[PDB]
Write a protein that binds this ligand. Sequence first.
Ligand code: HEM
Length: 153
Amino acid sequence: VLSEGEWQLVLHVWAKVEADVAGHGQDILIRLFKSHPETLEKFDRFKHLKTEAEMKASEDLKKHGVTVLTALGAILKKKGHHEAELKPLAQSHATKHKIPIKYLEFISEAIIHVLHSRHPGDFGADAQGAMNKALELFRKDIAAKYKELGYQG
Ligand code: HEM
């Protein structure tokens, strides 16, 4: 359970992200795909991209990055009371997209790295730990829906 102070740290940085949702989403998916290439293989949409320059030039990858971050933003702003917003994300990610929990750990590391790069003054260690805790709570609650559905592993 995050504390109110920890939520304030999370959403203080998140408000900085919302000024350039698309640039953040490009940098986080690129980082994800370069750091963990198995992840790129899950997107039929993107698996033609073979260099980071091709990734950076894809408008469709930029579009999906905004989809991802808008969904995550709507979850963080519920401060833990996010059951309505995860149901559908867990259902589609487990049963249609086939994404293992560990790849949600990987995109969480990429989100944390990009935020540190772009917002160091609002993303010191207190805010890094709170955001870690927020992303762990996301993964915990998604893992429980996976497990219901027979996909936790
Ligand atoms: C913060 C974590 C994430 C969030 C908030 C998120 C959000 C979304 C949303 C809102 C969609 C479109 C609606 C839907 O299908 O449910 C989506 C689609 C999809 N996601 Fe995620 N996602 C996350 C992580 C991942 C990860 C780590 C992967 C792959 C490794 C992945 C793979 C996909 C795929 C394959 C689709 C369909 C893309 C297409 O072909 O249009 N997602 N995601």
